[PDB]
Every structure is written in C-alpha cells, then in structure tokens.
C-alpha cells in the first residue's frame, strides 16, 4: 500500500514513426435549412425614420 521513488532520470523512449493510416469513411454532410445569420441584415420587417417633429 506504499511505494516511494528517489530523484531519478526518465530518459525519453526510442521513437518509432507511425505507419500512415488509411480510411474509407466519408463524413455525412450536415443538413441545415435555415436563415443561418443572426444580425439585423436578416430582419423580416424593417422600418426607419429620419430625425423629425410630430405631424
């Protein structure tokens, strides 16, 4: 239930380059049908008025 260890050197292991992996999977395309944008250029209704005095 106990284990100690002195101040020891942990040398880096020998490196072995990986063999390039091959896959055939094709990622399914994302189905999104919507406005997408969320700023004010997306407004469905827009009205504006210049600085004015009540009629």
């Amino acid at each position: 239930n106990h284990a100690t260890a002195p101040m020891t050197r942990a040398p880096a292991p020998e490196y072995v380059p990986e063999a390039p992996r091959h896959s055939d999977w094709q990622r399914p395309t994302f189905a999104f049908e919507g406005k997408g944008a969320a700023g004010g250029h997306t407004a469905t209704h827009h009205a504006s008025a210049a600085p004015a005095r009540p009629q």
Partner: protein, 549 residues
C-alpha cells in the same frame, strides 16, 4: 419606565398610528407606523460629521420584509429571510426617490433609513406605510430635511378615484398610481394604467396630492410634540472669488464654443478651453485644487447649456425641443428565438427577445401579502459596453431593476388575458447602446418582439422620456431627452402607452412651481412623441406573426 408618544388619525378608510419614543432609542429617530394592522418600523441614523473630501450625498434606504409579519415560517432552505428580493429593492427605491431631492444642497453626511415590515394585513400594502414612516422618521430626527412628504396610492374604479384601495379593490381597478409630494408640490409619481387618457392620469396625481395633506399635517403635529432639536448644520461656504476667476476666464469662451454645430470639434474645443483655464489658474497659485476647478468648469458649462435651451437655441445635438431622434426598427434578427427585435432611437439601442413557455415555467413568488403566480416575466440587462465603459457584468444595480419594472409596467397593459393565450411569456431586453432612456426603447422593443413571436397583444406600445426645464415663469419641454441632458431636467417624466392611452407613467419633480396646466402641456407633447414613434413602429410589423409555442 419608557413612555411612548402616540398620534392617531384617519386616512381615508384606514386609521394610521404613529408611535415614537419607545423603540430604538439609540438612533437619530425611530417610528412605528401602523395602518390598520399593517405595522412597519422605520429607523433613521444620521452621522454628525461628514467625511473629509466627500463630494456626493451618501443616502442609503433599505426596505426589509419579515415573514413572521404574515404569520408564516419562511420557505427557503435555511428557513430564514435573506438578500433583498426584487420587490423589496423596488420599494426601497420607491421610498428613496422622493426623500433624496429634499436634503439641502451641500449636505453630504451619511444617512441610512431602514424600514422593516413587522406586521402585515393582507389587504393593506406596506409600501405606503413604509413611505409615511420614512417621512415621519426623517422629520423627527433633526437632520436638515425640507418638509415632511406624504404618500398615497390611487386607483380608478367605476370611473371614480379611490384612495389606498385594498387588494380586492385593486383587482377591479384600471389604475395603480403612487404619488408622493410635500405640502407645496408633488415630487414623485409611479403608476401603471390600463390605457387611460392624460386627463384621467393627471386627475389621479392631483387627487392623491390633495389627499396626502392629512398625513403631512399629522406628521407636522407629531414633530411639534416629540421632535428632536434641529441640527446646526451650515452648508460649506462657496468660493465666490474662484467662481468669478473661472467665469471671467472661460464662460464667454464656452458660450461661443457651444455655437459649434459639430460634436467632435465642439467637445475638442471645450476640452482645450478647460485645459487652458486650469493651466492658467493652477500656475497662478499652486494651492488651488484641480478637481474643484473642474467642478466649477462643469457648472459653468451646465449653466450655458441651460441658458441656451431656455433661450430657444438648438440643443447640444442640434435638435429643437419637440424633435425626436432617428428611428430604426428591425424584427426577426435572431434565428432560433421565438421572437426578436432590434429597436434603435438615435444612439439608444435595445435588442429584445420574447420566449414562450407552458404553465410550468410561470414564476411562483411567496410574498407577505400572498402567494402569486407571474406568467409574464420581464428581464432587463444593462451591460457596461452600452455606455462604452468597462465594468462588472451580471450584477444588476437598483437602477436597472427600477428600469426593468418600469418597462414591464409599460408593456403589461396590452398583454393578452390567460383564456385567449394560455402560455407563459418571458421578455428579455438587452440594452446595446444607451444615450437616453433605455427603458422606453425597452418598451418599444418588447412590443415588437411580442408581435414577432406571435403573442396576440391588444395593441402596440411605445415609450417616450421627456424633460421640463423651468426658470421663473419660463419653461421648455424637451422631447427625447439624452443622457447628457439630465442636469436640464427640472421635471423628468417617462410616459409609455399605445395609440389610445397611457399604460405607465413615471414622474420625478424636483422643483416647486409645476402646476397642472404645465403637466398637461408636457403630457400632450409626450403624447405627440409617442404617436410618432408608434407610427414608425407600425410600418414594420402591424399584427402578431403566428408562430409555434
């Protein structure tokens, strides 16, 4: 033993008891006010020495509701009352608004008013009792205070004005107006109405002002019997010589600078004038403080602006007194919200959203006067970047709560009744720019978002923040006040409503002289402004856009 002093009078259908001299004898003043069976204990402690180098007046009003007043054990996890709720904060703000302007100028001692609801009658609201207690305690304390204030609540039932209506009467009332004022003039009005006219909403203010004189007179009698000696406080003497110096240096130059029609150049020139004057004076005598010189320069600038406005000259933005800023209305901005709207008035912008839910989403509030189910939830978010500043987020102040409540009151009159629309509606209003009244843009944005979501509201509501500057017999009403024009507001009113009536009214009068006729002129100009804004709004969305729940 202890000897209490008790004064009883008749306020409408209620009996009001003011008791003093027995409880909290180590405070500046303490009053127990009991209207029927609603008893509130109000205490005022005022510090006799001001802090060195103290600029603003520190006034703190706390309002606390104790659950044992209703004979109930609090239902919180710890079974104990905690941080003030929203309603308590709102009532503390309500009490603070009238009393604050009534402390003499130059008074900077620290004053804390604490109101505690110690007993509640379910049919008598404790906020008016708390206001009466605050006025009585501040009048019996000795602290320099200019006159007792009264407080009244007015409702409109069967086409008649009723004073301090009960909750049962308030359920059949088309009005709920709180009016506070001194003997001479009205000082604060906060109201909510079901699309009432301007004459109908001014009659209530007049009626409640006339009916609160009994409270004012009885508080005066109580102060005569059992009032503490008046504080020997004198305002710090003004440096007339320094005010002259700076006036002769910069007043005419600032007045000439204010004829400049461009904002950037005019402000740059104003800063140049200030820097040159502070340089000169500072060099002449090193003793002179720079902060006081800056304050004098600010006062001179404010006086110049007031003189221009009252002389008929263009405002600090080039506008006239009856001109509204530019409007931009958009609906349908956010892609996945139930309803959304962007409302821009000049440089005040609000992005408001509306969300629909079921009955499970309705808020349940455990209140002293009774449990309530809120199916319309209005929330208000005022982030720092709205004013171009850096600060802490997610910690609403008392201002943003009073503003959220005012916007909710403005929109509440047109909301559909439960039978037609059986859902819960949450409106969230984020203020993206603030150079004026963000709460009234919140009301317009809320109307637009509620129509975009599909809520079958009765009519579209818009709000306008107006101001009135008086000097002698000359007054000017200013439409669509900015945030840099606050000093110009002798009366600052915010009116919300539809094309047919007022749905919420908030006035804050700080001077004496504003008669009823002046108020009619101001509310007719505000009506014209609101109808302009509503016309612009209807050009975008004109009826609820049906949508999902």
């Amino acid at each position: 033993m202890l000897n209490p002093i008790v004064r009883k009078f008749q306020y409408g259908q209620h009996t009001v008891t003011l008791e003093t001299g027995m409880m909290a004898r180590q405070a500046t003043a303490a009053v127990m006010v009991s209207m029927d069976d609603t008893a509130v204990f109000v205490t005022v402690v005022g510090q006799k020495k001001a802090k060195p180098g103290q600029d603003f007046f520190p006034l703190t009003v706390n309002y606390q509701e104790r659950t044992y007043a209703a004979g109930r054990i609090p239902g919180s996890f710890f079974r104990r009352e905690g941080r003030p709720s929203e309603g308590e904060t709102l009532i503390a703000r309500l009490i603070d608004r009238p009393i604050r302007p009534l402390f003499p100028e130059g008074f900077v001692n620290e004053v804390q008013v604490i109101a505690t609801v110690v007993s509640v009658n379910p049919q008598v609201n404790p906020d008016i009792v708390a206001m009466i207690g605050a006025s009585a305690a501040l009048s019996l304390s000795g602290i320099p205070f200019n006159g007792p204030i009264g407080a009244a609540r007015v409702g409109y039932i069967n086409d008649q004005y009723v004073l301090n209506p009960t909750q049962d009467e308030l359920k059949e009332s088309k009005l709920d107006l709180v009016v506070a004022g001194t003997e001479a003039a009205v000082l604060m009005v906060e109201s909510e109405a079901q699309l009432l006219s301007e004459d109908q909403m001014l009659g209530a203010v007049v009626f409640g002002h006339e009916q609160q004189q009994v409270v004012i007179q009885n508080i005066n009698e109580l102060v005569k019997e059992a009032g503490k000696p008046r504080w020997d406080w004198q305002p710090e003497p003004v440096n007339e010589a320094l005010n002259a110096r700076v006036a002769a240096l910069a007043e005419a130059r600032l007045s000439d600078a204010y004829r400049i029609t461009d904002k950037q150049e005019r402000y740059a020139q104003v800063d140049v004038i200030k820097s040159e004057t502070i340089a000169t004076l500072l060099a002449e005598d090193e003793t002179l403080d720079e902060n006081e010189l800056g304050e004098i320069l600010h006062a001179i600038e404010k006086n110049v602006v007031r003189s221009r406005v009252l002389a008929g000259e263009p405002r600090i933005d080039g506008r006239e007194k009856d001109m509204i800023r530019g409007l931009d209305v958009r609906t349908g901005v956010l892609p996945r919200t139930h309803g959304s709207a962007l409302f821009t008035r000049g440089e005040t912008q609000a992005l408001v959203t509306a969300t629909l839910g079921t009955a499970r989403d309705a808020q349940v509030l455990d209140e002293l006067m009774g449990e309530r189910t809120d199916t319309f939830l209005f929330h208000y978010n005022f982030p720092p970047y709205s004013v171009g500043e850096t600060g802490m987020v997610g910690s609403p102040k008392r201002r943003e709560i009073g503003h959220g409540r005012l916007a909710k009151r403005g929109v509440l009159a047109v909301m559909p009744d439960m039978d037609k629309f059986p859902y819960t509606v949450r409106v969230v209003s984020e203020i993206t720019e603030s150079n004026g009244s963000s709460s009234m843009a919140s009301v317009c944005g809320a109307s637009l978002a509620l129509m975009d979501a599909g809520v079958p509201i009765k009519a579209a509501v818009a709000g306008i923040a107006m101001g009135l500057v008086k000097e002698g017999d000359n007054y000017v009403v200013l439409s669509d006040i900015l945030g840099d024009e606050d000093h110009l507001g002798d009366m600052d009113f915010k009116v919300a409503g539809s094309r047919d009536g007022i749905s919420a009214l908030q006035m804050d009068i700080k001077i004496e002289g504003i008669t009823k006729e002046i108020m009619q002129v101001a509310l007719n100009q505000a009506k014209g402004a609101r109808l302009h804004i509503l016309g612009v709004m209807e050009q975008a969305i004109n009826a609820p856009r049906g949508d999902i729940s």
